[PDB]
Design a protein around this ligand. Structure first.
Ligand code: MG
Lengths: 154, 690, 27, 492, 237, 37, 87, 83, 225
C-alpha cells in the first residue's frame, strides 16, 4: 500500500508540472528504501532490538538458524529515508564521503570491516574497471577467434 | 562600476549566509536604487546601482529630489527627500496632466502610499510630484529605447550586456537613442572636454593647443592606443579644426566608444526578421560579409606581456642573443640584446625577449655525450627560458617598456631587469563572436554568409544581419521590433503632409518632427517615447530614397528577394535598422585545448586554466553519465591514464607514436596518496586478493 | 540640450522636466 | 559534429605526428612536432586522414542526465567554434546564446568502441526517462512543416469538382507534374488537389479496400485528394510507412517518430529525422513568419471590458471604504474580479486573431510559447505578485504593445527578480537531490535474466464507465507500458 | 583570369533514366549560381511533344460516364497525360485511338501517323467491358517547358474536344544540393550534386548537353558586348 | 529499457538511469508542493 | 612542476637510442664495440683506452687510431642528417 | 534490407550488428579484442611470423582497424564465447 | 513553342550606372537568370586595388604621424575606399608626398603610367605647418575579397603595412521582371536588370565579362558531356 501510495504521490507532482516519467524509476528507488527490517525481539542469534539489517540476510540466517538455535527474531518492515538508507551502507569505502567521515572511519577501523569491492563507487575511486555495462565478467572475459572455415579460407 | 551599490563585503552580510528577502525589491528602492540593473549570476539583488537623480545624505542615506506641489499647484521647489520622510507623505507621478499653471486636471490621480500602496487620490492631498519620469532607473538602463515595452528579464540581460560592448575602430553613433548619451559620455571621463572657452590655436593627432580668450595657451595631450584593463584600445581622436571657436564644457576629443560627443556602443545595420535556413536557429545570428569587408565590427586588442631578469645562486639571468641550440633565422626579428623590434609581426610560439639562465652542471647521458662528441659542440651549460608568446596570439608589437636595476629604476627584490612588451592585434568579426542588441537579444554568430547569398531588398541593398522570429514572442521583448521600425523610419527620412493641417495621430507629436532628413539622429526618452499611433503614422509617410521607391509599406514589412534561389519570398518581411553591439566574449578568448601540457605539483593531475594549456574537469555528473551508459573502459581511461597514472601517460604517448596497443591502466596517484595518508594516520590498511 | 557642443539630436519629449541630470560622479 | 581545425590540430597531435612520420615528411618525431608548430599545409591533409573515422565526445556543462554526454564524428570545419548538429540541442539543453561545450577524446580501441557504439548520436534517440524521442523536430522546423502540411481552402489552383463546359480541372497525374505546375505560378503548395500516387502507401482503409492482402506501393497506383505539401511530406517518410494526410502538429510528429522507433530499425529513423530537419528548415524559410507591430493586433472592445470590471472593483473597494467588510475579503474579491477580467480579455483576444497571424501560428503549431505570453503581449498582464508570494490588487491593465506605466513596470520587477532568484535556488537544490538519488541507487544493476517469481503489482489499465465503456486511463503510458506480464490474461 | 582549380564533371548512373550528375570543385559559391539556372533550364528550355486536347465519341457533357469501359474519364485523362510521344513537326497533328470489343487497351494499340512515335507502347490505358467500341482523337503538338490546360478560347471547335495539360519537358524530376568539399587545402570549395529523372524519350546525359547548349547560346548575348573584357577563363579541358 | 526499445541487457546500471531521470526535471519543477515536497 | 616528465622527450630519447644503435650497427663489429665500450653505451660505464685495448688485446695507440677513424666515418652528413636533427 | 545506404561512422548499421551477438556489450568487447589482434598483427609485421590472423576482408587505403573489425563482424568471419 | 530567340538591349541612365532589358524569355526563368548574373557581377569581377603601403615616418599600423590630424589606421580606412584601375598584372607602385599646411585629397597622388585613380575629390588627411607626409602604395590586379597577406608570408621588412583588398568594380545590382503571361499561352518574361558600378569600369564592360565567365562555366557541364 505504501509503495502504491508513494508512486502515485510523486508521479502526481510530475504530472502537475507536465513531465512524464515512467514509474519503474520510482519503483527502483522505493525498492531501495524497503530493503532493511528492524528487530523488536532478538531471537537467539546475535541480535540487538532496534537494529536495522537487510531483509534477505535476515531471512537466510533464519532459515539456517531454525535448526540448532531455532529462535526466529521478530522482524518488522521499516521505511528508512534516502540519507538514512545511504548511511546504512555495506562498505566503509562505499560510504567514506557523506557525513561524519571521521566517525565512519574510526569504527570502520574498530570493526576491521573489510571491503569486497562490489559496488561501482569504490571501483571508481580505486580506478578499477567497474562491474557495470562493459565491466562485468560475462563481457570482460570474451574469447575471440575467427571461425575455422574462414580461417582456413584466408 | 562607479556609482555601484554592493551589499556584500566586510561589515555587511556575506553572500551565502544572506537569505532571499534582501535580494528582493522593497518599494523604498523607487527613485534610489534601480530595480532593473543587477548581475544575473549568483549575485542577484546584492549588487545594484544608483538611480539617475539619487544623491547621498550626509547621514549616509539616499536622498531623492521631488517637485513639491502645493494646493494642487505644482511648484518648483525641488526638495531632496529621503526614505523615511517619503513615507510621511504621498507622492503623485510624472505622467500627470498639468494645465501649464501647475494644476492637475484629473480629480483622481495616481499616487504612492507609504507601504507601497497605489490609489486614486482626490486631487488635493498630494504634496510631492516627481521631478521627471525615469527617476527609478539607472544610467545604463536609461540608454535603452522602448524600455516600457520590454519585460524586465530581457531588459535586465540587455542592460547587463550593455556594459560589455567593445570599442570599434570607427565608433559610429546610433540613429535611435535616449537623451542620456551626451550627458553620460561627458561624465564618462574618457572624453577630453574643452575646459575653458576660447579658440583653437593648433591641432595634431596627439595634442590640441587651445588659445584662451585672455592670454594663456593650453595643450591637451591625447591618449592614443593606450591599453585598457581588458585589452581594449583607448584612442582619443580630436574632432575640431584649427579655426574653430570652442566653449567651456564642450567636447573636443572623442573617446573609445564615442562619436561627436555622445555615446556609440556599436553600429547601425540593416536587419530582417526572417528565419533563414536554420542558420538563425535559437538565437543564432548570421551576418553579411560586408561587415568583414568594411571593418564595421573590428576592435583593436592590446595585450601586454612581461618577463624579468632575476638573481640566482648559479649566477644571474641574462637577456641576450646568445641563446644556445637554435637557428639564426628565428633570431632575426630581435635586436642585439634579445628583445624584438617595433612592428615585427609575431606568430604563436615565437621569441619575444631573448633571455637565458645559468643552469650549472649535471652528468651527461652517454648518448648525448656521443652526439656532442660527433658534432663538435660544447655543453653550453646555460639554460634558455626566453619569453615566448603563448598560443593563438599574434599581431604587431607596438611598444617596449623596459626597467633596469642598474639604471636606478625601482624593482622588486632580487630582480635585475624588467621588460614589458605591448603586443597588439586587430581582430575581425568571426563566426562565434557574441553579438547583442540593446534588448537582451544576444547570440553567437552562426554563419558569415558571402555578400551575394543574402536576402536582399528590391533596390539591390542586401540586409546586414538576420535575426530569428521565434525568439521574439516568447521572450516578451518587442522593443527590438519598435526599434527596427523606428530605425527604418529614421534611415529613410520623412516629411508628413500638412495640407489639411496636422493629421490626428500626430497631434501630441511636437513640432520640428513633421519632417526629417534621411540618416538623422533622433531620441526617444525612456518612459516618454513614441506611441503606437505616432510610430505607425510616421511609418505611413516615409519618403523614397533615389527613385520613386516606397520600399517599406505602412505595415513595416517589405518584399525581399532570395540571393540564393532567386525567387521572391511569398510574404513581406519585417526589415529596418537596429543598433547592435559587439561583446567581449570572443572566440580566441575562450577557445582552449590540450593534448599534453603542464601538470600539477602536489597532485599529479594536469594543471588547468587558459593561462596554461589547461585541462577540462571531468566532473561528478560526467562520471554518473558514463556509468549510465556503462562504458566502463572509457571511464577507466579518463580516470586513470589521462589524470594520474604517472607511469601510464608516457607509455600511452609512446604506444601512440609507435602505433601500438594502448596498455593497461595502472593504479592512479590519488589512490596511493589516500593509502599513504591512512597509513600515516595510524591505520593499518590491508589489501588482499584472497 | 543646453550643452554647447551637443549635436542636434531630436527628441520625443512630451513633458518638459525642470531638473537636469546631476554631476554623476558626485557620489 | 563540426570542429575547429586549430583545436583538433592540438587534440590529434600525436596521431598526426605518427602519420607524418609514416609518410616521409619528417626524419623523426621532433621535426614532426616542429612542423606541427609551423603548420606546413600538407599537415592539414594528414590531419583529415587521421580524423577520418575516429569519434570524439562532447559535453555541455552541467551534465543533467545520460544524454549530456554524446559521441559524434568530427569533421574539419573553418572557423573556431564547434559546429553542433541542431537536433541534439534538446538533449544538451544548449541554446546558442554563448554556452560552451567540452570535447573529450577516447584513446584505446575499447574506448573508441564504447564511443562508437554506445554514446553515438544515432543510437540514442529516445528518452531514457520515458521513451519519447529527443531528436524530434522543434522550434523552427516544426513551424516549417506545419506550414508545409497545413491545408488551406480558398487557394490558387485549388481542386473543384464542378464542370461547366470545362472539366473539373484539378487533378494531376504525377507528383512530378504537380511540382512542375507548382513551380509555374498556378499551384500554390497548400492547395487541395487530386494526385495519382504510385510510390506511396495508402492508409489502411484505402489499402485494404483496394488490394486487401497488400497495397504494396512499389508497384501499385492509386489516387487521393490531398495537398501537394503533404505528398512531399510523406516522401520524406520511409517506403513501408502508410500515408498520413494530417496537419503536422508537434504531437502528431511525436506519435509518428514513436511509431517509427517502435517498428523500424534505428538507422532508418535517424535518416528520416535528418530529412525532416532539412525540409523543415527549407519551409521555415518560405513560411513568412515575421513579427511586425502591425501584426500584434489589439482587441477592440478591451476598453469597455476594463470599464465593466473597473466599476465592479470600484463598488467592491467602495464597500470596503464603508467598512462593512475587512481588508482580506476585499483583497480576495479584487483578485477574483481581475482574474475574471484577465480571462475575459484573453478570451476576446483568442477569438479575435485570424489563423495566419504568425504569433498565434507559432503557438497553435506547438513550436513554443503558451497563450498567456501572447495575451501579455497584446491585452493585459493581469496580476503581478507580491514579493512575499501574494497578489498585488492594483493590477497592470496594459499590454507591452501599449507600454506600461512607471508604477506598473516597477510592480513587474518584483516577480521578475523573484523568479530569477528562485531559478538559481531550484537548479542548485535539484543538483543536491540528484546527488542524494545517486547516493541511494548506485548499486542496483541487472545481474540475471529472470528471477522467475510469480508475484507482482497490478495496473488500473483503462477503467470502464458507469455504462461500462472502457475509457482509457490517461496515465497508462507512464505505468503500464514497457512491462512484462508475470501472469497470463484470459478473456472471461 | 586564372581559374586556379578546374571544375570537372563526373556522372554517376543510377536506374535507366535517372542519371546522377556531380560537379567538383566549385569556387565559393558558384554551386547556387549555376545549379538553379541549370535546373530551370532542364525544366523549361527543352523542346518536346505532348497531348494538347482529346475528343471522345459518346461523351456529351457529363464527363464521367463512358459506356462499355471499366475506367473513369478523368483516369483516362491522366493516363493520356503520362504518355511519352515525340513529334518532328511544328504543327498540331491529330491521331486516332480506336478499338472495338471487350478487352484491354494498351498504348501500342494506337495508330501513329507520320512524325509521332510512342516510346512506351506497352503502357496500359484502358479496358473495355463487353463488346464496347472506343474512338478517341488525340491532338499532339510540341513545345517547351510546362503548360497548363489551355482555356476555352477555342470553344466552338471544342464541342467534342476537351483540353488537357501538356508536359512538354522530357525531364520529370530535377533536384540538387551543394557541398563544402576540402575546406582547408582547396580553401572552402563547393560541390554540386544533381539528380535528374527523365522519361524514355531522351537520355538525361543528352538532356544535360542540350541544356548546356541553350544556356551558352543564352549567355552569348551577354558575351557579345565587349569580347575584349577580361572574364575568368577555365583553360584546357 | 526505455531508450533502446528492446529488452534491457544483463549489465545496465538502472539505478543511475533512474536517478538522473527523476532528478532532471527539477529545473522545470516550478513549485509545500514542489521540490522540497 | 618544472622538474616533471615532459613525456615527448622520453620517447624522443628512446628513438635517439634506437636509431643510434642502428647507425652504430652500420659499421663493423670491432668499431661498434670500441665506441660502445668507450662511451659506456652498452652498460653505462665508459671503459677507457686500457680496458678497450685489454678486451681487444692491443695497444692504447691502436684503440686511439681506430676511434679516430670511427670519428672520421661518422662525420658524413649522409650518415648524420637524422643525427643533426636530434639536437 | 532495402532502406538506404549508410556512410562513414555508421556503416555497418548496428541494427544489423546486434542481429549477430547477444547484447551490445558483447559486440563492444568483441570488436575491441579483434581490433587489438589486428593492431598486434600490424606491429608484428616488422618481426617474424606468428599465427595472429588478420586482416580478413580487404582494408581501405588508410582505414582504422576498429572499422575493419566491425566490418568483418558484419561479414560473419569471426566468432566468440562469453565470459 | 513560341518562336523567337531572346534579345539583349541596353539602357543608359547615368555614367556610372545603366540598365539592361532581356526579352522574350521562358516563363518562370527571369528571376533565376537575374540571380545568376547578380551573384556573378557582385562577386567575381576582376579589379585592382591597393594592397600594402609604407610610410617612412612610422613602422607599424597602430600609431600616429607627426603633423597630420588623423592617425595611421584612419588613413587606412580612408584609403580603403579609393578606386583605381590597372592594365597589367604586375604590382605597380605609386607615391604621394605632401608638405606644409593644407588638406590632402586623393587627386594629389601621382600614379605611374598605366594605372589611374578615378575619384580625385576623396579626402585622405589634412596637415599643418608641422605636417610632413610621404606614403607609397602597392596596387595589383585581383578578383574578389582577400584579407591582408602577412608580412612573414612576404619577405619584406618592417615598413610594409598590409591592407585588406576589395576587388569589386561593381557597386550595386538589382533587377525586376515583367511577366506578361496572357491567357493565350504566348507567355514570356522580360528581365529588366539594373547595374550600378563604382566608376571603375563601365556597366557594359562588367556585364560582358560576367557573361563570358558564364559561357566558360556552363561550357564545362555542357560538353564535358
Ligand atoms: Mg544559454
Amino acid at each position: 500500500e505504501v509503495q502504491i501510495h508513494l508512486v502515485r504521490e510523486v508521479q502526481e507532482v510530475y504530472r502537475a508540472q507536465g513531465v512524464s516519467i515512467h514509474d519503474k524509476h520510482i519503483e527502483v528507488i522505493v525498492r531501495q528504501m524497503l530493503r532493511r527490517v528492524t528487530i523488536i525481539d532478538s531471537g537467539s542469534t546475535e541480535f540487538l532490538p532496534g537494529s536495522l539489517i537487510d531483509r534477505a540476510e535476515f531471512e537466510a540466517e533464519n532459515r539456517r538458524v531454525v535448526a540448532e538455535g531455532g529462535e526466529p527474531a521478530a522482524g518488522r518492515p521499516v521505511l528508512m529515508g534516502i540519507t538514512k538508507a545511504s548511511l546504512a551502507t555495506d562498505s566503509w569505502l562505499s560510504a567514506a564521503s557523506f557525513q561524519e567521515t571521521t566517525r565512519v572511519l574510526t569504527d570502520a577501523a574498530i570493526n576491521c570491516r573489510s571491503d569486497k569491492l562490489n559496488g561501482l563507487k569504490e571501483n571508481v575511486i580505486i580506478g578499477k574497471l567497474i562491474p557495470a555495462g562493459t565491466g562485468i565478467n560475462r563481457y570482460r572475459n570474451i574469447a575471440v577467434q575467427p571461425t575455422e572455415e574462414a580461417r582456413a579460407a584466408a | 562600476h562607479k556609482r555601484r551599490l554592493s551589499a556584500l563585503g566586510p561589515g555587511g552580510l556575506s553572500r551565502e549566509r544572506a537569505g532571499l528577502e534582501v535580494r528582493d525589491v522593497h518599494p523604498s528602492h523607487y527613485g534610489r536604487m534601480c530595480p532593473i540593473e543587477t548581475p544575473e549570476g549568483p549575485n542577484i539583488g546584492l549588487i545594484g546601482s544608483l538611480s539617475v537623480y539619487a544623491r547621498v545624505n550626509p547621514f549616509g542615506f539616499i536622498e531623492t529630489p521631488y517637485r513639491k506641489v502645493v494646493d494642487g499647484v505644482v511648484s518648483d521647489e525641488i526638495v531632496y527627500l529621503t526614505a523615511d520622510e517619503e513615507d510621511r507623505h504621498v507622492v503623485a507621478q510624472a505622467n500627470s496632466p498639468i494645465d501649464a499653471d501647475g494644476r492637475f486636471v484629473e480629480p483622481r490621480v495616481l499616487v504612492r502610499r507609504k507601504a507601497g500602496e497605489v490609489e486614486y487620490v482626490p486631487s488635493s492631498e498630494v504634496d510631492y510630484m516627481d521631478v521627471s519620469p525615469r527617476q527609478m532607473v539607472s544610467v545604463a538602463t536609461a540608454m535603452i529605447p522602448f524600455l516600457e515595452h520590454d519585460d524586465a528579464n530581457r531588459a535586465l540581460m540587455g542592460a547587463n550586456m550593455q556594459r560589455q560592448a567593445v570599442p570599434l575602430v570607427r565608433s559610429e553613433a546610433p540613429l535611435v537613442g535616449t537623451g542620456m548619451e551626451l550627458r553620460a559620455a561627458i561624465d564618462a571621463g574618457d572624453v577630453v572636454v574643452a575646459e575653458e572657452s576660447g579658440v583653437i590655436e593648433e591641432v595634431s593627432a596627439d595634442y590640441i593647443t587651445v588659445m584662451h580668450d585672455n592670454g594663456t595657451r593650453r595643450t591637451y595631450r591625447m591618449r592614443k592606443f593606450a591599453r585598457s584593463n581588458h585589452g581594449t584600445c583607448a584612442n582619443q581622436c580630436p574632432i575640431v579644426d584649427a579655426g574653430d571657436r570652442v566653449e567651456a564644457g564642450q567636447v573636443i576629443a572623442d573617446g573609445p566608444c564615442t562619436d561627436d560627443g555622445e555615446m556609440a556602443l556599436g553600429k547601425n545595420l540593416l536587419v530582417a526578421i526572417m528565419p533563414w535556413e536554420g542558420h538563425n536557429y535559437e538565437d543564432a545570428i548570421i551576418l553579411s560579409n560586408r561587415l568583414v569587408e568594411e571593418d564595421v565590427l573590428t576592435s583593436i586588442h592590446i595585450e601586454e606581456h612581461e618577463i624579468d631578469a632575476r638573481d640566482t645562486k648559479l649566477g644571474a639571468e641574462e637577456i641576450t642573443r646568445d641563446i644556445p641550440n637554435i637557428s639564426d633565422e628565428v633570431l632575426a626579428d630581435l635586436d642585439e640584446r634579445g628583445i624584438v623590434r617595433i612592428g615585427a609581426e609575431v606568430r604563436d610560439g615565437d621569441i619575444l625577449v631573448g633571455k637565458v639562465t645559468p643552469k650549472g652542471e649535471t652528468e651527461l647521458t652517454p648518448e648525448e655525450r656521443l652526439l656532442r662528441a660527433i658534432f663538435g659542440e660544447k655543453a653550453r651549460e646555460v639554460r634558455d627560458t626566453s619569453l615566448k608568446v603563448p598560443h593563438g596570439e599574434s599581431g604587431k608589437v607596438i611598444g617596449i617598456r623596459v626597467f633596469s636595476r642598474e639604471d636606478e629604476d625601482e624593482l622588486p627584490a632580487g630582480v635585475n631587469e624588467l621588460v614589458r612588451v605591448y603586443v597588439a592585434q586587430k581582430r575581425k568579426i568571426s563566426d562565434g563572436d557574441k553579438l547583442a542588441g540593446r534588448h537582451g537579444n544576444k547570440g553567437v554568430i552562426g554563419k558569415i554568409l558571402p555578400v551575394e547569398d543574402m536576402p536582399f531588398l528590391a533596390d539591390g541593398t542586401p540586409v546586414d544581419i538576420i535575426l530569428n522570429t521565434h525568439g521574439v514572442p516568447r521572450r516578451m521583448n518587442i522593443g527590438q521590433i519598435l526599434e527596427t521600425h523606428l530605425g527604418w523610419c529614421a534611415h529613410s527620412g520623412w516629411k508628413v503632409d500638412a495640407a489639411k493641417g496636422v493629421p490626428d495621430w500626430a497631434a501630441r507629436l511636437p513640432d520640428e518632427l513633421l519632417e526629417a532628413q534621411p540618416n538623422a539622429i533622433v531620441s526617444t526618452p525612456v518612459f516618454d517615447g513614441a506611441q503606437e499611433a505616432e510610430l505607425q503614422g510616421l511609418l505611413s509617410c516615409t519618403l523614397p530614397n533615389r527613385d520613386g521607391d516606397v520600399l517599406v509599406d505602412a505595415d513595416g514589412k517589405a518584399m525581399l528577394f532570395d540571393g540564393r534561389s532567386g525567387e521572391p519570398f511569398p510574404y513581406p518581411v519585417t526589415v529596418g535598422y537596429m543598433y547592435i553591439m559587439k561583446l567581449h566574449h570572443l572566440v580566441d578568448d575562450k577557445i582552449h585545448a590540450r593534448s599534453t601540457g603542464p601538470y600539477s605539483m602536489i597532485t599529479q593531475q594536469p594543471l588547468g586554466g587558459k593561462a596554461q594549456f589547461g585541462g577540462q574537469r571531468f566532473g561528478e555528473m560526467e562520471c554518473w553519465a558514463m556509468q549510465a551508459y556503462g562504458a566502463a573502459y572509457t571511464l577507466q581511461e579518463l580516470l586513470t591514464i589521462k589524470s594520474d597514472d604517472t607511469v601510464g601517460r608516457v607509455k600511452v604517448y609512446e604506444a601512440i607514436v609507435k602505433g601500438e596497443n594502448i596498455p593497461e591502466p595502472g593504479i592512479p596517484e590519488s589512490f596511493k596518496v589516500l593509502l599513504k595518508e591512512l597509513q600515516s594516520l595510524c591505520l593499518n590498511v590491508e589489501v588482499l586478493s584472497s | 540640450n543646453s550643452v554647447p557642443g551637443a549635436p542636434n539630436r531630436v527628441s520625443f519629449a512630451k513633458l518638459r522636466e525642470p531638473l537636469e541630470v546631476p554631476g554623476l560622479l558626485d557620489v | 559534429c563540426g570542429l575547429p581545425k586549430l583545436m583538433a590540430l592540438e587534440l590529434f597531435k600525436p596521431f598526426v605526428m605518427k602519420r607524418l612520420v609514416d609518410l616521409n615528411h619528417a626524419q623523426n618525431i621532433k621535426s614532426a612536432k616542429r612542423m606541427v608548430e609551423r603548420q606546413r599545409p600538407q599537415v592539414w591533409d594528414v590531419l583529415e586522414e587521421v580524423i577520418a573515422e575516429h569519434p570524439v565526445l562532447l559535453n555541455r556543462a552541467p551534465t543533467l542526465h545520460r544524454l549530456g554526454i554524446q559521441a559524434f564524428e568530427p569533421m574539419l570545419v573553418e572557423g573556431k567554434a564547434i559546429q553542433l548538429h541542431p537536433l541534439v540541442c534538446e538533449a544538451f539543453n544548449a541554446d546558442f546564446d554563448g554556452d560552451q561545450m567540452a570535447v573529450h577524446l577516447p584513446l584505446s580501441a575499447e574506448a573508441q568502441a564504447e564511443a562508437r557504439i554506445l554514446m553515438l548520436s544515432s543510437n540514442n534517440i529516445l528518452s531514457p526517462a520515458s521513451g519519447r524521442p529527443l531528436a524530434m523536430p522543434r522550434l523552427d522546423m516544426v513551424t516549417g512543416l506545419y506550414y508545409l502540411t497545413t491545408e488551406v481552402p480558398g487557394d490558387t489552383g485549388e481542386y473543384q469538382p464542378a464542370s461547366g463546359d470545362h472539366p473539373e480541372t484539378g487533378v494531376y497525374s504525377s507528383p512530378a507534374e504537380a511540382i512542375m505546375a507548382a513551380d509555374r505560378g498556378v499551384l500554390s503548395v497548400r492547395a487541395k488537389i487530386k494526385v495519382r500516387l504510385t510510390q506511396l502507401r495508402p492508409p489502411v482503409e484505402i489499402e485494404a479496400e483496394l488490394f486487401g492482402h497488400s497495397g504494396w506501393q512499389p508497384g501499385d497506383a492509386w489516387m487521393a485528394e490531398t495537398t501537394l505539401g503533404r505528398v512531399m511530406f510523406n516522401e520524406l517518410l520511409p517506403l513501408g510507412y502508410p500515408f498520413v494526410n494530417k496537419q503536422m502538429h508537434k504531437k502528431v510528429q511525436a506519435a509518428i517518430i514513436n511509431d517509427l522507433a517502435e517498428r523500424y530499425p534505428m538507422i532508418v529513423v535517424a535518416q528520416t529525422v535528418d530529412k525532416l530537419k532539412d525540409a523543415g528548415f527549407y519551409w521555415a524559410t518560405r513560411s513568412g513568419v515575421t513579427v511586425s507591430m502591425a501584426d500584434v493586433l489589439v482587441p477592440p472592445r478591451k476598453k469597455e471590458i476594463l470599464d465593466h470590471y473597473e466599476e465592479r472593483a470600484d463598488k467592491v473597494e467602495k464597500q470596503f471604504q464603508r467598512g462593512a467588510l475587512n481588508h482580506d475579503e476585499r483583497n480576495e474579491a479584487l483578485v477574483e474580479i481581475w482574474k475574471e477580467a484577465t480571462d475575459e480579455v484573453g478570451q476576446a483576444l483568442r477569438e479575435h486573431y485570424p489563423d495566419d497571424n504568425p504569433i498565434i501560428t507559432i503557438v497553435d503549431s506547438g513550436a513554443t510559447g503558451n497563450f498567456t505570453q501572447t495575451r501579455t503581449l497584446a491585452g493585459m498582464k493581469g496580476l503581478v505578485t507580491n514579493p512575499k508570494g501574494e497578489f498585488i490588487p492594483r493590477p497592470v491593465k496594459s499590454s507591452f504593445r501599449e507600454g506600461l506605466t512607471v508604477l506598473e513596470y516597477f510592480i513587474n520587477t518584483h516577480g521578475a527578480r523573484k523568479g530569477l532568484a528562485d531559478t538559481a535556488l531550484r537548479t542548485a537544490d535539484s543538483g543536491y537531490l540528484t546527488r542524494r538519488l545517486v547516493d541511494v541507487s548506485q548499486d542496483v544493476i541487472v545481474r540475471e535474466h529472470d528471477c522467475q517469481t510469480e508475484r507482482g503489482i497490478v495496473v488500473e489499465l483503462a477503467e470502464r464507465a458507469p455504462d461500462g465503456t472502457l475509457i482509457r486511463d490517461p496515465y497508462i503510458e507512464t505505468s503500464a507500458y514497457a512491462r512484462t506480464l508475470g501472469t497470463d490474461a484470459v478473456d472471461e | 583570369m586564372l581559374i586556379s582549380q578546374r571544375p570537372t564533371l563526373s556522372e554517376d548512373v543510377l536506374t535507366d533514366n535517372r542519371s546522377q550528375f556531380v560537379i567538383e570543385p566549385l569556387e565559393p559559391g558558384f554551386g547556387y549560381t549555376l545549379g538553379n539556372s541549370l535546373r530551370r533550364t532542364l525544366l523549361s528550355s527543352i523542346p518536346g511533344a505532348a497531348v494538347t486536347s482529346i475528343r471522345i465519341d459518346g461523351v456529351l457533357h457529363e464527363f464521367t460516364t463512358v459506356p462499355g469501359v471499366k475506367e473513369d474519364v478523368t483516369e483516362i485523362i491522366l493516363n493520356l497525360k503520362s504518355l511519352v510521344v515525340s513529334s518532328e513537326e511544328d504543327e498540331p497533328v491529330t491521331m486516332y485511338l480506336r478499338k472495338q470489343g471487350p478487352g484491354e487497351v494498351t498504348a501500342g494499340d494506337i495508330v501513329p501517323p507520320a512524325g509521332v512515335t510512342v516510346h512506351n507502347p506497352g503502357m496500359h490505358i484502358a479496358t473495355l467491358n463487353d463488346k464496347g467500341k472506343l474512338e478517341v482523337e488525340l491532338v499532339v503538338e510540341r513545345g517547351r517547358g510546362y503548360v497548363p490546360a489551355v482555356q476555352n478560347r477555342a470553344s466552338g471547335a471544342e464541342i467534342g474536344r476537351i483540353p488537357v495539360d501538356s508536359i512538354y519537358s522530357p525531364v520529370l524530376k530535377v533536384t540538387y544540393k551543394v557541398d563544402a568539399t576540402r575546406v582547408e587545402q582547396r580553401t572552402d570549395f563547393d560541390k554540386l550534386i544533381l539528380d535528374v529523372e527523365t522519361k524514355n524519350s531522351i537520355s538525361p546525359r543528352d538532356a544535360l548537353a542540350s541544356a548546356g547548349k541553350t544556356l551558352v547560346e543564352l549567355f552569348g548575348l551577354a558575351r557579345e558586348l565587349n569580347v575584349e573584357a577580361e572574364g575568368i577563363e577555365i583553360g584546357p579541358s | 529499457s526505455m531508450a533502446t526499445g528492446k529488452l534491457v541487457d544483463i549489465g545496465e546500471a538502472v539505478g543511475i538511469v533512474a536517478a538522473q531521470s527523476i532528478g532532471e526535471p527539477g529545473t522545470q519543477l516550478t513549485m509545500t508542493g514542489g521540490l522540497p515536497r | 612542476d618544472s622538474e616533471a616528465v615532459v613525456a615527448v622527450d622520453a620517447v624522443s630519447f628512446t628513438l635517439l637510442q634506437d636509431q643510434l644503435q642502428s647507425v652504430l650497427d652500420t659499421l663493423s663489429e670491432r668499431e661498434a664495440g670500441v665506441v660502445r665500450l668507450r662511451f659506456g653505451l652498452t652498460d653505462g660505464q665508459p671503459r677507457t683506452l686500457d680496458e678497450i685495448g685489454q678486451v681487444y688485446g692491443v695497444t692504447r695507440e691502436r684503440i686511439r687510431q681506430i676511434e679516430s677513424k670511427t670519428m672520421s666515418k661518422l662525420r658524413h652528413p649522409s650518415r648524420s642528417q637524422v643525427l643533426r636533427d636530434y639536437l | 534490407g532495402g532502406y538506404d545506404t549508410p556512410l562513414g561512422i555508421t556503416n555497418p548499421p548496428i541494427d544489423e550488428l546486434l542481429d549477430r551477438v547477444s547484447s551490445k556489450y558483447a559486440l563492444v568487447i568483441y570488436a575491441a579484442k579483434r581490433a587489438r589482434q589486428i593492431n598486434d598483427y600490424y606491429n608484428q609485421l616488422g618481426e617474424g611470423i606468428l599465427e595472429y590472423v588478420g586482416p580478413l576482408v580487404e582494408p581501405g587505403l588508410q582505414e582504422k582497424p576498429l572499422s575493419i573489425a566491425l566490418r568483418e563482424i558484419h561479414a560473419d568471419l569471426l566468432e566468440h564465447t562469453e565470459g
